[PDB]
Amino acid sequence: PMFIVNTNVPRASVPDGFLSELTQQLAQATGKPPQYIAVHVVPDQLMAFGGSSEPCALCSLHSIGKIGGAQNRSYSKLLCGLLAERLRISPDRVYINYYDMNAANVGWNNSTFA
Amino acid sequence: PMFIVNTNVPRASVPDGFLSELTQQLAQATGKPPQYIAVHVVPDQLMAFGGSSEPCALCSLHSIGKIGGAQNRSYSKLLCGLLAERLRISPDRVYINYYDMNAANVGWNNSTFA
Amino acid sequence: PMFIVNTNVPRASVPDGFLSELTQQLAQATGKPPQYIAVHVVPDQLMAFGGSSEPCALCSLHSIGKIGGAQNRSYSKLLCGLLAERLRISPDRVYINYYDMNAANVGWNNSTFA
Ligand SMILES: Oc1ccc(-n2cc(-c3ccc4ccccc4n3)nn2)cc1
């Protein structure tokens, strides 16, 4: 799986240990082993949410399965949670895009997962 | 909705109020309220369009509904217009990807839209 | 077509010509004239793959058609090769998402491809 965060929060306010935490928490929630999880944090970004430049987050989670209504509800509770706890962003200023990828449309190790 | 502009144009060339104007303009066009539109500009990027590194842009608009043939056509006139006027980028060096999101696949405020 | 790669490899590890080379190789592979190919490389990124900060990369390829099982396998082999040969990234630390875009959902030059 693949989680990307884009946030107007400056790099300094991102803790050490944050990528490891995202990695272990997403592994636990998706059931995918940590070895297959990728995280990408993008601080210091030039973004607004609803006209205002208070702290915010634009994110995405791509996964081959383990995507759907109840799972996405759960994932968003877990992620908004970490973004609030660790980056002090308020959940109503977070948007997450969820992608259920087909194995044929994901490339890895010179080939695809199909 | 979620709007991102990646561009090779440098930061100093992005006018102040560009985010505001995008927020306000995407609101009118989509019919979505300004307060839920989130915008994101990424300037000073290493990119090429057509082999060339003359000014160019790659955008994306994610949205639950309001994504369709005529709407997208309307949005592209609107967003190219703005990119040309304010960033001095030629429209024929702009790609916009439109994504119509299912509500269950968009997280916000500890849950999803579904 | 549109190729984006984000990597925690430094700006200086990216050799000159890389964008041009991607543009050309993607023109051949996609069967599209380079006039329509856009590439975008994002070095220095804060990211992790399998919870490790060794070199890695997260890419995507967006195209109106030209996306499918046998083709994606061929893209991956081509693109993982360029990312190994030019950025010293191990192919088992590259993920590439492929997206088959509908003409109507891609904007360019004040309009859509529809
Ligand atoms: O990445 C995404 C995808 C979709 C959206 N999205 C938000 C909304 C939304 C939010 C609030 C609204 C309030 C009134 C009417 C429509 C509204 N639509 N629609 N699409 C946001 C981020």
DSSP A45-65: -EEEETTB-SS-EEEEEEESS
**Distance, CA of C53 to CA of C59 (rounded, Å):** 17
Amino acid found at A20: S
- The answer to whether C20 and C86 have CB atoms below 8 angstroms apart is no
Closest-CA distance, A25 to chain B, in angstroms, reads 16
**Distance, CA of A83 to CA of A7 (rounded, Å):** 10
- Helices first, then strands: H and E counts in chain A: 2, 7
Residue B1 annotated among the catalytic residues of the structure: yes
Using CA atoms, how far residue C85 sits from C14, C25, C80, C93, in Å, is 11, 14, 8, 14
Q: Residue A48 pairs with which residues in a beta bridge?
A: B39
Q: Experimentally, how was this structure solved? A: X-ray
**Distance, CA of B22 to CA of B86 (rounded, Å):** 11
* Structure tokens belonging to residue B46: 């290493």
Residue C60 in contact with partner chain A when CB distance is under 8 A: no
**Distance, CA of A59 to CA of A57 (rounded, Å):** 6
Q: In terms of DSSP bridges, do strands C94-100 and C46-49 run parallel, antiparallel, or are they unpaired?
A: unpaired
Q: Report helix, strand or coil for C37.
A: coil
Neighbours of chain B (3+ CB pairs under 8 A): A, C
**Distance, CA of B50 to CA of C101 (rounded, Å):** 19
Cβ of A40 within 8 Å of Cβ of C77? The answer is no
Q: Which residues contact A16 (CB under 8 A, 6 or more apart)?
A: none
**Distance, CA of A46 to CA of B22 (rounded, Å):** 13
- The answer to whether C90 and C7 have CB atoms below 8 angstroms apart is no
Q: Per the structure, how many domains does chain B have? A: 1
- The answer to whether A7 and A56 have CB atoms below 8 angstroms apart is yes
Q: Which residues contact B101 (CB under 8 A, 6 or more apart)?
A: A97, B62, B63, B64
- Tell me, rounded to whole angstroms, the distance of Cα B63 from its chain centroid: 11
Rounded (10°) angle between helices B18-30 and B69-87: 160
Residue B64 in contact with partner chain A when CB distance is under 8 A: no
**Distance, CA of B33 to CA of B23 (rounded, Å):** 9
* Structure tokens belonging to residue C30: 């996609």
Closest-CA distance, A34 to chain B, in angstroms, reads 22
- The CATH code of the domain that includes B51 is 3.30.429.10
Ligand 1 pocket, Cβ-based, cut-off 6 angstroms: A 95, 97; B 1-2, 32-33, 36, 62-64, 101, 106
* Structure tokens belonging to residue C69: 């099982």
Residue with token string 């993607």: C26
Q: Residue A36: which domain range?
A: 1-114
